[PDB]
Design a protein around this ligand. Structure first.
Ligand code: HEM
Ligand code: HEM
Ligand SMILES: CN(C)C(=N)NCCC[C@H](N)C(=O)O
Ligand SMILES: CN(C)C(=N)NCCC[C@H](N)C(=O)O
Ligand SMILES: [Zn+2]
Lengths: 416, 414
């Protein structure tokens, strides 16, 4: 039939064709010889640092393309405003080598970048995003206020609201605005004498960076790390977040009275801060965004992963399961109760969270919406399916096509 | 060129150089990845309008022969050079050639080894290859199939085996087993759009009745075989009940579980895939080993479009089916997978849980890293349907490609 990828849902037997991928202008890791689609960081979703400004011709084509998407989103394609804005963009690039976005253009691109994110299962909310323009920001101290305002608005005392704060874009012949941290709120990871790690092993390097930068450490599993904010050409400055600004949730179990005694907990606000936001060829090296958590990110990955908190065995012992044999499914049983504890704790603390069932069910609805809207939806299957109960969720049985659309959230090298 | 692969749990890194030997193409391109698709019309070995080009068959054959003589270390000897001569001579004159029993045995083991969607590949060298190329009727196929079943089953101590029927010929129809597996349960489409039995087997159950089978009305009725000899109508053959070992499901602690009447067969034997060795294609080559517990407890019994028992079990467990946040599905699922493992263990029938299986797969990836420089794996198929991150494969980046010999998908004969 049609010349586009055929996609099937094995649960419903329904078929769809992805015409949207034809719009992709950025290559992926795969080739007809082999699939590199399971790699987290292939050198195809990562934007290396441009020490030199992008070739004026390449920037122009990305700019022209973005503007067209903008005017198209407002239904004025081919209009005088459209042709004038295009003229104004190449004019800017002509004399300055770069250009700047209008306010409403930034809002559009940021929402599109999220909408374009293949690894996000929460894209059904893509239209509801608070874009805080912080392109005026000129100091590391100002970055702190902006971030503090972001956390305040986004947190909204448990009734979380999606938001992003965009700092000045990459300017040739000038340093980047970078947030050294991976997320705004992160737990410290202390490298012990015996080699082990107290806290979160994932955050070991940054913790050692904060220390080297004057931070006076603690010695707990759940210590919130300070921010390491960097303004153009200046070394990073350290800023400590006010405790009242960081909402956390103490984990307890609905029935297992002893779970509370484990002293486990997690922060309520997930805010990625190390990713690059690329819009029309313009790069925004510092542009933290946040929304809310899906229960499995905390209860399964953060808490149960071998290279993270690794609490599966401890909880199994407390549940008195045969941890000596795999066929007892002690890992499956503890993980279930751990995920249930996260849900219960967040629901009790009136903080926003969504479980993996509801989450994926809403993504399917997002998929139908997008099929009608753009004729497809770029999705990364491995990241869309939850880390537990995979086939129990509707997305498992949904084939998916993955490709890179712009605007987009890309990975970038560490500033150090 | 060579993909850098990484294990996020151990921080280890490896470079896959085995993918360079891939000659067959997948569905992916630089524009978009199609790796999550079960069967693109591409890889599929569909029928043809004549004899393959001799240039290609010859090169696919020479490569395979080179592979075989390399396996037995005689790479270069006279036996190698003469086997190549024999193949060149036969392809040139007949437009085809035939394999020796030893080579076929090597090929079948190398097909399994090359299977990207197989998690049990650590058992790859342990395979009983029954040569059935001297078969000329559906009736003979049946006898061969029963022999395979009785061997593989082995009173519960399952053994991996494969029966290879006559290859495909440019001048005639194919030898085919219409069923997707030798043992399957019937799916009868009831009046109200409903489905009694296994829904995934509705079409094949219908075909059996079209060809004169007297059906039942149980949720677990074993289907008869539809074996097809070249250019002939398929024939119906009912498997002897004593040959088909089935396991009644019960829970170690939940007494009411047994009362649900659930049960599952012991032998998982795929009969609809095509085995390709050195350019030759074997359209009927059923293979079997043993189940990984998730295949039955999660997929077969819990998939929405299968037996879909999730809710019923939850109700029996008296769980909160009102909200998704009570994780009732996850809870019911775990007990079902537990009942399966307990049942196959109680019945002295070979089974492997996903934790055990995936750990052995990690070991296998390692053996293969030193052996061939890599290992084709389909991450989506390797990672179990439940508790994915709880297993080591989840944290392992994988490279997927097509190596030959290979098990490929093929059209339905009807
Ligand atoms: C509103 C609720 C949202 C939910 C529940 C949600 C959920 C998720 C989940 C489960 C992941 C997987 C992360 C992992 O496994 O490590 C993810 C990834 C992602 N989300 Fe969303 N998301 C939401 C909001 C947002 C917002 C507001 C943005 C951007 C404006 C966004 C951008 C992304 C991106 C780019 C990724 C990919 C991260 C990566 O490549 O590592 N998400 N999201
Ligand atoms: C030793 C016991 C074995 C175990 C535990 C095992 C397990 C598995 C599992 C779990 C799958 C995925 C099935 C699915 O999701 O539907 C699979 C697929 C596969 N296995 Fe293995 N396997 C074993 C033996 C074999 C043998 C003996 C062969 C062939 C000689 C083989 C060839 C394959 C092939 C070709 C597939 C792909 C099937 C498809 O595409 O539908 N396996 N195996
Ligand atoms: C609102 N966003 C972006 C998210 N829900 N998740 C982003 C990654 C969070 C990470 N898995 C974590 O658990 O920290
Ligand atoms: C011995 N082989 C290859 C297997 N273990 N499985 C093949 C597929 C069986 C199917 N998932 C089923 O549930 O019947
Ligand atoms: Zn791919």
């Amino acid at each position: 039939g049609p010349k586009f990828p055929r996609v099937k849902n094995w649960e419903l037997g329904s078929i769809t064709y992805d015409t949207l991928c034809a719009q992709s202008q950025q290559d992926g890791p795969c080739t007809p010889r082999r699939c590199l689609g399971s790699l987290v960081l292939p050198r195809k979703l990562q934007t290396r640092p441009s020490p030199g400004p992008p070739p004026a011709e390449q920037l122009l084509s990305q700019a022209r393309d973005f503007i067209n998407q903008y005017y198209s989103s407002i239904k004025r394609s081919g209009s005088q405003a459209h042709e004038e804005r295009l003229q104004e963009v190449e004019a800017e690039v002509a004399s300055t080598g770069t250009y700047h976005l209008r306010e409403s253009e930034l809002v559009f691109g940021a929402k599109q970048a999220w909408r374009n994110a293949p690894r996000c299962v929460g894209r059904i909310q893509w239209g509801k995003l608070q874009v805080f323009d912080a392109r005026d920001c000129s100091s590391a101290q100002e970055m702190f206020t902006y971030i503090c305002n972001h956390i305040k608005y986004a947190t909204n005392r448990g009734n979380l609201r999606s938001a992003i704060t965009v700092f000045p874009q990459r300017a040739p012949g000038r340093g980047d605005f970078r947030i050294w941290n991976s997320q705004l709120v992160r737990y410290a990871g202390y490298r012990q004498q015996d080699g082990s790690v107290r806290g979160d092993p994932a955050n070991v390097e940054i913790t050692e960076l904060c220390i080297q930068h004057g931070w006076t450490p603690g010695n707990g599993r759940f210590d919130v790390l300070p921010l390491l904010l960097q303004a153009p050409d200046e070394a990073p400055e350290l800023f400590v977040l006010p405790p009242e600004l960081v909402l956390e949730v103490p984990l307890e179990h609905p029935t297992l009275e002893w779970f509370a005694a484990l002293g486990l907990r997690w922060y309520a606000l997930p805010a990625v801060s190390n990713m690059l936001l690329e819009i029309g060829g313009l790069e925004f090296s510092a542009a933290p965004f946040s929304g809310w958590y899906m229960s499995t990110e905390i209860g399964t990955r953060n808490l149960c992963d071998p290279h993270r908190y690794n609490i599966l065995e401890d909880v199994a012992v407390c549940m008195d399961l045969d941890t000596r044999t795999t066929s007892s499914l002690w890992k499956d049983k503890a993980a279930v109760e751990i995920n249930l504890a996260v849900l219960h704790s967040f629901q009790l603390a009136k903080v926003t969270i969504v479980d993996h069932h509801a989450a994926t069910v809403s993504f399917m609805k997002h998929l139908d919406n997008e099929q009608k809207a753009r004729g497809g939806c770029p999705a990364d299957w491995a990241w869309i399916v939850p880390p537990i109960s995979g086939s129990l969720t509707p997305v498992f049985h949904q084939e998916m096509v993955n490709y890179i659309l712009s605007p987009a959230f890309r990975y970038q090298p560490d500033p150090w």
